A paper describes a structure:
We reasoned that to enable systematic design of binders to convex protein target sites it would be necessary to generate scaffold sets with overall concave shapes. We focused on 5 helix bundle scaffolds with three helices forming the concave interface and two helices providing structural support. The selected 7476 scaffolds, which we refer to as 5HCS (5 helix concave scaffolds) throughout the remainder of the text, have a wide range of curvatures. Our method for computationally designing small but concave proteins to bind to convex protein target sites expands the space of the protein surfaces that can be targeted by de novo protein design.
Residue numbers in the entry:
A (entry chain B): 1 to 104
B (entry chain A): 0 to 104
């Protein structure tokens, strides 16, 4: 899913530079598919990548529903980190939680 | 080697904060000095991130300026890796950790 996540990041940047919201629509379709695979495989690193792009979207638009989705995925990430006993992923999750709130 | 030492450093900071024994913070910073140098040579961004996370924890519990100075030096090294690799996700994780450093008292 490396190709899709990098393309999604690219489209988020192009959408903000051009104002073409159809590109943000496409980016979000890519992000949904990556999120679905991350959640189905319990992959915290993929989730972190999705969350990072969602935060970018929230900075650019202030969309509360995108913020809500990012918070949803952060809870899922913290669940995986606690399940696996990885305190560092847990701390990253908390550092990203701060970034969501400051982006609103 | 490095991962074990990192886990021990994190453990010692938790033990220091649990007991109030600041000599364990000292030992953790010693371990982190050694690992920070190893992880910089490995080029492994995860290991750098783990070390920075523990340094942030120590700054909050002690305020030690030299600990914060090391965290900033490693955040610079982490950003160089991100640039070299074209990895915007490492860049974003570095920025998120830098916000935490800049908000310590
Ligand atoms: C991001 C942050 C911390 C981490 N610890 C192990 C993997 C990993 C990824």
């Amino acid at each position: 899913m490396e190709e899709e996540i990098e393309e999604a990041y690219d489209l988020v940047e192009e959408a903000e530079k051009t104002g073409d919201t159809s590109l943000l629509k496409k980016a979000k379709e890519l992000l949904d598919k990556v999120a679905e695979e991350a959640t189905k495989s319990g992959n915290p690193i993929l989730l972190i990548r999705v969350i990072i792009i969602l935060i970018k979207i929230v900075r650019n638009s202030g969309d509360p529903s995108v913020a809500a989705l990012a918070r949803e995925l952060l809870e899922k990430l913290e669940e995986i980190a606690e399940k696996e006993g990885n305190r560092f992923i847990e701390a990253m999750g908390e550092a990203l939680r701060t970034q969501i709130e400051r982006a609103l």
